mmJSON file of the N, C-alpha and C atoms, coordinates in Angstrom:
{"data_MODEL":{"atom_site":{
"group_PDB":["ATOM","ATOM","ATOM","ATOM","ATOM","ATOM","ATOM","ATOM","ATOM","ATOM","ATOM","ATOM","ATOM","ATOM","ATOM","ATOM","ATOM","ATOM","ATOM","ATOM","ATOM","ATOM","ATOM","ATOM","ATOM","ATOM","ATOM","ATOM","ATOM","ATOM","ATOM","ATOM","ATOM","ATOM","ATOM","ATOM","ATOM","ATOM","ATOM","ATOM","ATOM","ATOM","ATOM","ATOM","ATOM","ATOM","ATOM","ATOM","ATOM","ATOM","ATOM","ATOM","ATOM","ATOM","ATOM","ATOM","ATOM","ATOM","ATOM","ATOM","ATOM","ATOM","ATOM","ATOM","ATOM","ATOM","ATOM","ATOM","ATOM","ATOM","ATOM","ATOM","ATOM","ATOM","ATOM","ATOM","ATOM","ATOM","ATOM","ATOM","ATOM","ATOM","ATOM","ATOM","ATOM","ATOM","ATOM","ATOM","ATOM","ATOM","ATOM","ATOM","ATOM","ATOM","ATOM","ATOM","ATOM","ATOM","ATOM","ATOM","ATOM","ATOM","ATOM","ATOM","ATOM","ATOM","ATOM","ATOM","ATOM","ATOM","ATOM","ATOM","ATOM","ATOM","ATOM","ATOM","ATOM","ATOM","ATOM","ATOM","ATOM","ATOM","ATOM","ATOM","ATOM","ATOM","ATOM","ATOM","ATOM","ATOM","ATOM","ATOM","ATOM","ATOM","ATOM","ATOM","ATOM","ATOM","ATOM","ATOM","ATOM","ATOM","ATOM","ATOM","ATOM","ATOM","ATOM","ATOM","ATOM","ATOM","ATOM","ATOM","ATOM","ATOM","ATOM","ATOM","ATOM","ATOM","ATOM","ATOM","ATOM","ATOM","ATOM","ATOM","ATOM","ATOM","ATOM","ATOM","ATOM","ATOM","ATOM","ATOM","ATOM","ATOM","ATOM","ATOM","ATOM","ATOM","ATOM","ATOM","ATOM","ATOM","ATOM","ATOM","ATOM","ATOM","ATOM","ATOM","ATOM","ATOM","ATOM","ATOM"],
"id":[1,2,3,4,5,6,7,8,9,10,11,12,13,14,15,16,17,18,19,20,21,22,23,24,25,26,27,28,29,30,31,32,33,34,35,36,37,38,39,40,41,42,43,44,45,46,47,48,49,50,51,52,53,54,55,56,57,58,59,60,61,62,63,64,65,66,67,68,69,70,71,72,73,74,75,76,77,78,79,80,81,82,83,84,85,86,87,88,89,90,91,92,93,94,95,96,97,98,99,100,101,102,103,104,105,106,107,108,109,110,111,112,113,114,115,116,117,118,119,120,121,122,123,124,125,126,127,128,129,130,131,132,133,134,135,136,137,138,139,140,141,142,143,144,145,146,147,148,149,150,151,152,153,154,155,156,157,158,159,160,161,162,163,164,165,166,167,168,169,170,171,172,173,174,175,176,177,178,179,180,181,182,183,184,185,186,187,188,189,190,191,192],
"type_symbol":["N","C","C","N","C","C","N","C","C","N","C","C","N","C","C","N","C","C","N","C","C","N","C","C","N","C","C","N","C","C","N","C","C","N","C","C","N","C","C","N","C","C","N","C","C","N","C","C","N","C","C","N","C","C","N","C","C","N","C","C","N","C","C","N","C","C","N","C","C","N","C","C","N","C","C","N","C","C","N","C","C","N","C","C","N","C","C","N","C","C","N","C","C","N","C","C","N","C","C","N","C","C","N","C","C","N","C","C","N","C","C","N","C","C","N","C","C","N","C","C","N","C","C","N","C","C","N","C","C","N","C","C","N","C","C","N","C","C","N","C","C","N","C","C","N","C","C","N","C","C","N","C","C","N","C","C","N","C","C","N","C","C","N","C","C","N","C","C","N","C","C","N","C","C","N","C","C","N","C","C","N","C","C","N","C","C","N","C","C","N","C","C"],
"label_atom_id":["N","CA","C","N","CA","C","N","CA","C","N","CA","C","N","CA","C","N","CA","C","N","CA","C","N","CA","C","N","CA","C","N","CA","C","N","CA","C","N","CA","C","N","CA","C","N","CA","C","N","CA","C","N","CA","C","N","CA","C","N","CA","C","N","CA","C","N","CA","C","N","CA","C","N","CA","C","N","CA","C","N","CA","C","N","CA","C","N","CA","C","N","CA","C","N","CA","C","N","CA","C","N","CA","C","N","CA","C","N","CA","C","N","CA","C","N","CA","C","N","CA","C","N","CA","C","N","CA","C","N","CA","C","N","CA","C","N","CA","C","N","CA","C","N","CA","C","N","CA","C","N","CA","C","N","CA","C","N","CA","C","N","CA","C","N","CA","C","N","CA","C","N","CA","C","N","CA","C","N","CA","C","N","CA","C","N","CA","C","N","CA","C","N","CA","C","N","CA","C","N","CA","C","N","CA","C","N","CA","C","N","CA","C","N","CA","C","N","CA","C","N","CA","C"],
"label_alt_id":[null,null,null,null,null,null,null,null,null,null,null,null,null,null,null,null,null,null,null,null,null,null,null,null,null,null,null,null,null,null,null,null,null,null,null,null,null,null,null,null,null,null,null,null,null,null,null,null,null,null,null,null,null,null,null,null,null,null,null,null,null,null,null,null,null,null,null,null,null,null,null,null,null,null,null,null,null,null,null,null,null,null,null,null,null,null,null,null,null,null,null,null,null,null,null,null,null,null,null,null,null,null,null,null,null,null,null,null,null,null,null,null,null,null,null,null,null,null,null,null,null,null,null,null,null,null,null,null,null,null,null,null,null,null,null,null,null,null,null,null,null,null,null,null,null,null,null,null,null,null,null,null,null,null,null,null,null,null,null,null,null,null,null,null,null,null,null,null,null,null,null,null,null,null,null,null,null,null,null,null,null,null,null,null,null,null,null,null,null,null,null,null],
"label_comp_id":["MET","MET","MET","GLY","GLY","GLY","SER","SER","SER","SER","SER","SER","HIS","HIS","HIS","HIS","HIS","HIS","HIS","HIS","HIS","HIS","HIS","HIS","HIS","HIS","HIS","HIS","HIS","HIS","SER","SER","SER","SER","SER","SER","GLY","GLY","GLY","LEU","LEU","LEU","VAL","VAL","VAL","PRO","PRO","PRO","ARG","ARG","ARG","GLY","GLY","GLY","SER","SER","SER","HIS","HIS","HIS","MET","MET","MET","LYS","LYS","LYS","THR","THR","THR","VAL","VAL","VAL","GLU","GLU","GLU","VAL","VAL","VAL","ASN","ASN","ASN","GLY","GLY","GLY","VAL","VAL","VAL","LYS","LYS","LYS","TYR","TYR","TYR","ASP","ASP","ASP","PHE","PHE","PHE","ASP","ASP","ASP","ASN","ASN","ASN","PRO","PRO","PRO","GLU","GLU","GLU","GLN","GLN","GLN","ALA","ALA","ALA","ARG","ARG","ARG","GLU","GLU","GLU","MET","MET","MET","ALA","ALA","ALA","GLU","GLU","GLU","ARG","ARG","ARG","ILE","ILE","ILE","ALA","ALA","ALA","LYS","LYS","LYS","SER","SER","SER","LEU","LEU","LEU","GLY","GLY","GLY","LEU","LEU","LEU","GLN","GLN","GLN","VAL","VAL","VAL","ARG","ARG","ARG","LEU","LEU","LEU","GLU","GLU","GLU","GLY","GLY","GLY","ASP","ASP","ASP","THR","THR","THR","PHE","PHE","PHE","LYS","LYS","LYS","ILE","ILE","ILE","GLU","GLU","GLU"],
"label_asym_id":["A","A","A","A","A","A","A","A","A","A","A","A","A","A","A","A","A","A","A","A","A","A","A","A","A","A","A","A","A","A","A","A","A","A","A","A","A","A","A","A","A","A","A","A","A","A","A","A","A","A","A","A","A","A","A","A","A","A","A","A","A","A","A","A","A","A","A","A","A","A","A","A","A","A","A","A","A","A","A","A","A","A","A","A","A","A","A","A","A","A","A","A","A","A","A","A","A","A","A","A","A","A","A","A","A","A","A","A","A","A","A","A","A","A","A","A","A","A","A","A","A","A","A","A","A","A","A","A","A","A","A","A","A","A","A","A","A","A","A","A","A","A","A","A","A","A","A","A","A","A","A","A","A","A","A","A","A","A","A","A","A","A","A","A","A","A","A","A","A","A","A","A","A","A","A","A","A","A","A","A","A","A","A","A","A","A","A","A","A","A","A","A"],
"label_entity_id":["1","1","1","1","1","1","1","1","1","1","1","1","1","1","1","1","1","1","1","1","1","1","1","1","1","1","1","1","1","1","1","1","1","1","1","1","1","1","1","1","1","1","1","1","1","1","1","1","1","1","1","1","1","1","1","1","1","1","1","1","1","1","1","1","1","1","1","1","1","1","1","1","1","1","1","1","1","1","1","1","1","1","1","1","1","1","1","1","1","1","1","1","1","1","1","1","1","1","1","1","1","1","1","1","1","1","1","1","1","1","1","1","1","1","1","1","1","1","1","1","1","1","1","1","1","1","1","1","1","1","1","1","1","1","1","1","1","1","1","1","1","1","1","1","1","1","1","1","1","1","1","1","1","1","1","1","1","1","1","1","1","1","1","1","1","1","1","1","1","1","1","1","1","1","1","1","1","1","1","1","1","1","1","1","1","1","1","1","1","1","1","1"],
"label_seq_id":[1,1,1,2,2,2,3,3,3,4,4,4,5,5,5,6,6,6,7,7,7,8,8,8,9,9,9,10,10,10,11,11,11,12,12,12,13,13,13,14,14,14,15,15,15,16,16,16,17,17,17,18,18,18,19,19,19,20,20,20,21,21,21,22,22,22,23,23,23,24,24,24,25,25,25,26,26,26,27,27,27,28,28,28,29,29,29,30,30,30,31,31,31,32,32,32,33,33,33,34,34,34,35,35,35,36,36,36,37,37,37,38,38,38,39,39,39,40,40,40,41,41,41,42,42,42,43,43,43,44,44,44,45,45,45,46,46,46,47,47,47,48,48,48,49,49,49,50,50,50,51,51,51,52,52,52,53,53,53,54,54,54,55,55,55,56,56,56,57,57,57,58,58,58,59,59,59,60,60,60,61,61,61,62,62,62,63,63,63,64,64,64],
"pdbx_PDB_ins_code":[null,null,null,null,null,null,null,null,null,null,null,null,null,null,null,null,null,null,null,null,null,null,null,null,null,null,null,null,null,null,null,null,null,null,null,null,null,null,null,null,null,null,null,null,null,null,null,null,null,null,null,null,null,null,null,null,null,null,null,null,null,null,null,null,null,null,null,null,null,null,null,null,null,null,null,null,null,null,null,null,null,null,null,null,null,null,null,null,null,null,null,null,null,null,null,null,null,null,null,null,null,null,null,null,null,null,null,null,null,null,null,null,null,null,null,null,null,null,null,null,null,null,null,null,null,null,null,null,null,null,null,null,null,null,null,null,null,null,null,null,null,null,null,null,null,null,null,null,null,null,null,null,null,null,null,null,null,null,null,null,null,null,null,null,null,null,null,null,null,null,null,null,null,null,null,null,null,null,null,null,null,null,null,null,null,null,null,null,null,null,null,null],
"Cartn_x":[179.741,179.216,180.313,180.412,181.54,180.814,179.482,178.745,179.199,180.609,181.027,180.982,179.691,179.601,178.138,177.962,176.725,175.546,174.756,173.283,172.378,172.449,171.51,171.065,169.813,169.186,168.528,169.416,168.904,170.159,169.772,170.836,170.608,171.721,171.345,172.865,173.037,174.236,174.081,172.795,172.517,172.481,172.39,172.573,173.888,175.138,176.381,176.544,177.807,178.48,178.837,177.858,178.123,178.973,180.0,181.195,181.417,182.347,182.809,184.04,184.434,185.153,186.76,187.577,188.834,189.794,189.761,190.17,191.746,192.327,194.04,193.941,194.029,194.363,195.626,196.492,197.684,197.633,198.52,198.794,197.268,196.305,195.022,194.053,194.506,193.482,193.408,191.963,191.409,191.478,191.784,191.842,191.454,189.867,189.441,189.747,189.686,189.945,188.946,189.012,188.253,188.228,189.436,189.694,190.66,190.289,191.106,192.44,192.697,193.97,195.06,194.571,195.088,195.249,194.515,194.493,195.8,196.039,197.06,198.34,198.509,199.781,199.965,199.171,199.218,199.786,199.221,199.387,200.885,201.574,202.753,203.929,203.343,204.068,204.258,203.22,203.028,204.016,203.894,204.706,206.139,206.712,208.172,208.638,207.8,207.933,208.087,207.142,206.925,207.838,208.265,209.093,208.145,207.005,205.833,205.552,204.629,204.471,202.695,202.351,201.126,200.507,199.797,199.158,197.868,197.429,195.885,195.311,194.241,193.576,191.948,191.519,190.134,190.143,189.588,189.634,190.442,190.683,191.472,193.08,193.587,195.267,195.871,196.004,196.401,197.989,198.518,199.947,200.587,201.061,201.51,202.855],
"Cartn_y":[185.139,185.988,187.175,187.247,188.019,189.415,189.77,190.871,192.279,192.505,193.791,194.672,195.191,195.841,196.936,197.736,198.402,197.8,197.33,196.46,197.244,198.518,199.457,200.629,200.364,201.393,202.478,203.212,204.396,205.497,206.242,207.411,208.355,208.615,209.288,210.076,210.695,211.151,212.728,213.34,214.687,214.64,213.407,213.05,213.792,213.47,214.23,213.949,214.688,214.263,212.868,212.118,210.414,210.285,210.68,210.239,208.62,208.295,206.991,206.679,205.506,205.042,205.352,205.948,206.342,205.306,205.052,203.872,204.03,202.992,203.002,202.537,203.347,202.899,202.842,201.579,201.385,200.735,201.443,201.008,201.07,202.002,201.974,200.88,200.096,199.018,199.684,199.675,200.335,199.133,199.319,198.673,199.333,199.148,199.67,198.999,199.39,198.881,198.954,198.363,198.434,199.972,200.278,201.877,202.561,203.931,204.503,205.001,204.803,205.224,204.063,202.705,201.64,201.462,202.053,202.081,203.239,204.056,205.002,204.393,203.941,203.064,202.145,201.346,200.188,200.925,201.937,202.713,203.123,203.67,204.217,202.958,201.88,200.69,199.976,200.083,199.544,200.529,201.961,202.741,202.825,202.506,202.333,200.894,199.807,198.545,198.718,199.125,199.361,200.527,201.365,202.589,203.809,203.573,204.56,205.69,206.33,207.394,207.594,207.712,207.672,209.158,209.469,210.709,210.481,210.881,211.099,212.187,211.974,213.092,212.725,213.579,213.449,212.561,211.331,210.265,209.013,209.136,207.79,208.196,207.424,207.437,206.678,207.354,206.868,206.723,205.332,205.192,204.912,206.101,205.997,207.032],
"Cartn_z":[80.576,79.546,79.2,77.803,77.389,76.798,77.359,77.035,77.722,77.715,78.02,76.883,76.321,75.498,75.707,74.763,74.791,74.605,75.648,75.689,76.53,76.472,77.287,76.496,75.586,74.877,75.705,76.359,77.361,77.064,76.048,75.725,76.989,78.054,79.305,79.443,80.714,80.961,80.341,80.477,79.975,78.365,77.726,76.335,75.599,75.85,75.483,74.048,73.584,72.287,72.097,71.539,71.186,70.257,70.283,69.337,69.146,68.175,67.98,69.25,69.526,70.529,69.974,70.897,70.51,70.148,68.872,68.098,67.664,67.729,67.232,65.859,64.763,63.421,63.019,63.036,62.649,61.17,60.333,59.028,58.201,58.626,58.064,58.595,59.476,60.168,61.585,61.953,63.054,64.138,65.497,66.601,67.868,68.244,69.445,70.585,71.856,73.11,74.164,75.538,76.591,77.132,77.259,77.894,76.81,76.404,75.52,75.874,77.411,78.071,77.688,77.814,77.399,75.838,75.144,73.617,73.351,73.926,73.521,73.939,75.078,75.538,74.517,74.278,73.108,71.847,71.454,70.12,69.99,71.159,71.057,71.197,71.843,71.927,70.501,69.538,68.234,67.585,67.67,66.772,67.04,67.972,68.065,67.798,67.721,67.134,65.803,64.754,63.645,63.027,63.861,63.426,62.992,63.376,62.732,63.723,63.644,64.696,64.939,66.099,66.596,66.398,65.122,65.084,65.334,66.305,66.82,66.252,65.393,64.757,64.891,65.58,66.379,67.472,67.262,68.349,67.706,66.59,65.859,65.786,66.977,66.971,65.874,64.593,63.482,63.306,63.642,63.497,62.067,61.563,60.117,60.29],
"occupancy":[1.0,1.0,1.0,1.0,1.0,1.0,1.0,1.0,1.0,1.0,1.0,1.0,1.0,1.0,1.0,1.0,1.0,1.0,1.0,1.0,1.0,1.0,1.0,1.0,1.0,1.0,1.0,1.0,1.0,1.0,1.0,1.0,1.0,1.0,1.0,1.0,1.0,1.0,1.0,1.0,1.0,1.0,1.0,1.0,1.0,1.0,1.0,1.0,1.0,1.0,1.0,1.0,1.0,1.0,1.0,1.0,1.0,1.0,1.0,1.0,1.0,1.0,1.0,1.0,1.0,1.0,1.0,1.0,1.0,1.0,1.0,1.0,1.0,1.0,1.0,1.0,1.0,1.0,1.0,1.0,1.0,1.0,1.0,1.0,1.0,1.0,1.0,1.0,1.0,1.0,1.0,1.0,1.0,1.0,1.0,1.0,1.0,1.0,1.0,1.0,1.0,1.0,1.0,1.0,1.0,1.0,1.0,1.0,1.0,1.0,1.0,1.0,1.0,1.0,1.0,1.0,1.0,1.0,1.0,1.0,1.0,1.0,1.0,1.0,1.0,1.0,1.0,1.0,1.0,1.0,1.0,1.0,1.0,1.0,1.0,1.0,1.0,1.0,1.0,1.0,1.0,1.0,1.0,1.0,1.0,1.0,1.0,1.0,1.0,1.0,1.0,1.0,1.0,1.0,1.0,1.0,1.0,1.0,1.0,1.0,1.0,1.0,1.0,1.0,1.0,1.0,1.0,1.0,1.0,1.0,1.0,1.0,1.0,1.0,1.0,1.0,1.0,1.0,1.0,1.0,1.0,1.0,1.0,1.0,1.0,1.0,1.0,1.0,1.0,1.0,1.0,1.0],
"B_iso_or_equiv":[0.0,0.0,0.0,0.0,0.0,0.0,0.0,0.0,0.0,0.0,0.0,0.0,0.0,0.0,0.0,0.0,0.0,0.0,0.0,0.0,0.0,0.0,0.0,0.0,0.0,0.0,0.0,0.0,0.0,0.0,0.0,0.0,0.0,0.0,0.0,0.0,0.0,0.0,0.0,0.0,0.0,0.0,0.0,0.0,0.0,0.0,0.0,0.0,0.0,0.0,0.0,0.0,0.0,0.0,0.0,0.0,0.0,0.0,0.0,0.0,0.0,0.0,0.0,0.0,0.0,0.0,0.0,0.0,0.0,0.0,0.0,0.0,0.0,0.0,0.0,0.0,0.0,0.0,0.0,0.0,0.0,0.0,0.0,0.0,0.0,0.0,0.0,0.0,0.0,0.0,0.0,0.0,0.0,0.0,0.0,0.0,0.0,0.0,0.0,0.0,0.0,0.0,0.0,0.0,0.0,0.0,0.0,0.0,0.0,0.0,0.0,0.0,0.0,0.0,0.0,0.0,0.0,0.0,0.0,0.0,0.0,0.0,0.0,0.0,0.0,0.0,0.0,0.0,0.0,0.0,0.0,0.0,0.0,0.0,0.0,0.0,0.0,0.0,0.0,0.0,0.0,0.0,0.0,0.0,0.0,0.0,0.0,0.0,0.0,0.0,0.0,0.0,0.0,0.0,0.0,0.0,0.0,0.0,0.0,0.0,0.0,0.0,0.0,0.0,0.0,0.0,0.0,0.0,0.0,0.0,0.0,0.0,0.0,0.0,0.0,0.0,0.0,0.0,0.0,0.0,0.0,0.0,0.0,0.0,0.0,0.0,0.0,0.0,0.0,0.0,0.0,0.0],
"pdbx_formal_charge":[null,null,null,null,null,null,null,null,null,null,null,null,null,null,null,null,null,null,null,null,null,null,null,null,null,null,null,null,null,null,null,null,null,null,null,null,null,null,null,null,null,null,null,null,null,null,null,null,null,null,null,null,null,null,null,null,null,null,null,null,null,null,null,null,null,null,null,null,null,null,null,null,null,null,null,null,null,null,null,null,null,null,null,null,null,null,null,null,null,null,null,null,null,null,null,null,null,null,null,null,null,null,null,null,null,null,null,null,null,null,null,null,null,null,null,null,null,null,null,null,null,null,null,null,null,null,null,null,null,null,null,null,null,null,null,null,null,null,null,null,null,null,null,null,null,null,null,null,null,null,null,null,null,null,null,null,null,null,null,null,null,null,null,null,null,null,null,null,null,null,null,null,null,null,null,null,null,null,null,null,null,null,null,null,null,null,null,null,null,null,null,null],
"auth_seq_id":[1,1,1,2,2,2,3,3,3,4,4,4,5,5,5,6,6,6,7,7,7,8,8,8,9,9,9,10,10,10,11,11,11,12,12,12,13,13,13,14,14,14,15,15,15,16,16,16,17,17,17,18,18,18,19,19,19,20,20,20,21,21,21,22,22,22,23,23,23,24,24,24,25,25,25,26,26,26,27,27,27,28,28,28,29,29,29,30,30,30,31,31,31,32,32,32,33,33,33,34,34,34,35,35,35,36,36,36,37,37,37,38,38,38,39,39,39,40,40,40,41,41,41,42,42,42,43,43,43,44,44,44,45,45,45,46,46,46,47,47,47,48,48,48,49,49,49,50,50,50,51,51,51,52,52,52,53,53,53,54,54,54,55,55,55,56,56,56,57,57,57,58,58,58,59,59,59,60,60,60,61,61,61,62,62,62,63,63,63,64,64,64],
"auth_comp_id":["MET","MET","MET","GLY","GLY","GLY","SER","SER","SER","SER","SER","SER","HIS","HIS","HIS","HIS","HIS","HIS","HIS","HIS","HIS","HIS","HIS","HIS","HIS","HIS","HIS","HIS","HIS","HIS","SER","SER","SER","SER","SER","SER","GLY","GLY","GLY","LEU","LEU","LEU","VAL","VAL","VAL","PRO","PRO","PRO","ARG","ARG","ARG","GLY","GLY","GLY","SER","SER","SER","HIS","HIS","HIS","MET","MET","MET","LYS","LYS","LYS","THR","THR","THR","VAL","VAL","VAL","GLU","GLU","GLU","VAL","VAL","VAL","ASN","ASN","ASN","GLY","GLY","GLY","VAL","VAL","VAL","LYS","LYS","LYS","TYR","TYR","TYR","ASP","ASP","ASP","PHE","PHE","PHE","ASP","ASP","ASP","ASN","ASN","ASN","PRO","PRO","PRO","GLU","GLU","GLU","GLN","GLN","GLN","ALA","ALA","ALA","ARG","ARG","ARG","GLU","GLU","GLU","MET","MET","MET","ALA","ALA","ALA","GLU","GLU","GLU","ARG","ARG","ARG","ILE","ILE","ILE","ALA","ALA","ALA","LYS","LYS","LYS","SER","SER","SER","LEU","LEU","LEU","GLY","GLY","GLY","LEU","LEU","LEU","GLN","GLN","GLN","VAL","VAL","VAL","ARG","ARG","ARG","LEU","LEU","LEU","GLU","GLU","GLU","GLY","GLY","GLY","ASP","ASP","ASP","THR","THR","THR","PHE","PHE","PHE","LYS","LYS","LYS","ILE","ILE","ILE","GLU","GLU","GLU"],
"auth_asym_id":["A","A","A","A","A","A","A","A","A","A","A","A","A","A","A","A","A","A","A","A","A","A","A","A","A","A","A","A","A","A","A","A","A","A","A","A","A","A","A","A","A","A","A","A","A","A","A","A","A","A","A","A","A","A","A","A","A","A","A","A","A","A","A","A","A","A","A","A","A","A","A","A","A","A","A","A","A","A","A","A","A","A","A","A","A","A","A","A","A","A","A","A","A","A","A","A","A","A","A","A","A","A","A","A","A","A","A","A","A","A","A","A","A","A","A","A","A","A","A","A","A","A","A","A","A","A","A","A","A","A","A","A","A","A","A","A","A","A","A","A","A","A","A","A","A","A","A","A","A","A","A","A","A","A","A","A","A","A","A","A","A","A","A","A","A","A","A","A","A","A","A","A","A","A","A","A","A","A","A","A","A","A","A","A","A","A","A","A","A","A","A","A"],
"auth_atom_id":["N","CA","C","N","CA","C","N","CA","C","N","CA","C","N","CA","C","N","CA","C","N","CA","C","N","CA","C","N","CA","C","N","CA","C","N","CA","C","N","CA","C","N","CA","C","N","CA","C","N","CA","C","N","CA","C","N","CA","C","N","CA","C","N","CA","C","N","CA","C","N","CA","C","N","CA","C","N","CA","C","N","CA","C","N","CA","C","N","CA","C","N","CA","C","N","CA","C","N","CA","C","N","CA","C","N","CA","C","N","CA","C","N","CA","C","N","CA","C","N","CA","C","N","CA","C","N","CA","C","N","CA","C","N","CA","C","N","CA","C","N","CA","C","N","CA","C","N","CA","C","N","CA","C","N","CA","C","N","CA","C","N","CA","C","N","CA","C","N","CA","C","N","CA","C","N","CA","C","N","CA","C","N","CA","C","N","CA","C","N","CA","C","N","CA","C","N","CA","C","N","CA","C","N","CA","C","N","CA","C","N","CA","C","N","CA","C","N","CA","C","N","CA","C"],
"pdbx_PDB_model_num":[1,1,1,1,1,1,1,1,1,1,1,1,1,1,1,1,1,1,1,1,1,1,1,1,1,1,1,1,1,1,1,1,1,1,1,1,1,1,1,1,1,1,1,1,1,1,1,1,1,1,1,1,1,1,1,1,1,1,1,1,1,1,1,1,1,1,1,1,1,1,1,1,1,1,1,1,1,1,1,1,1,1,1,1,1,1,1,1,1,1,1,1,1,1,1,1,1,1,1,1,1,1,1,1,1,1,1,1,1,1,1,1,1,1,1,1,1,1,1,1,1,1,1,1,1,1,1,1,1,1,1,1,1,1,1,1,1,1,1,1,1,1,1,1,1,1,1,1,1,1,1,1,1,1,1,1,1,1,1,1,1,1,1,1,1,1,1,1,1,1,1,1,1,1,1,1,1,1,1,1,1,1,1,1,1,1,1,1,1,1,1,1]
}}}
């Protein structure tokens, strides 16, 4: 099963600030990950590749 996603309709954990997942938006195209830590390292590896810069703004690591 590839069901490693939200399939638990029980908002708990003191009901926190339920923001969007820390997405990596390169060249305007969004890319989410399993872990935001792995997303950020991927982001900075894409940045140096395309010559762009990872401007994280909110939760969106915008590589422009």
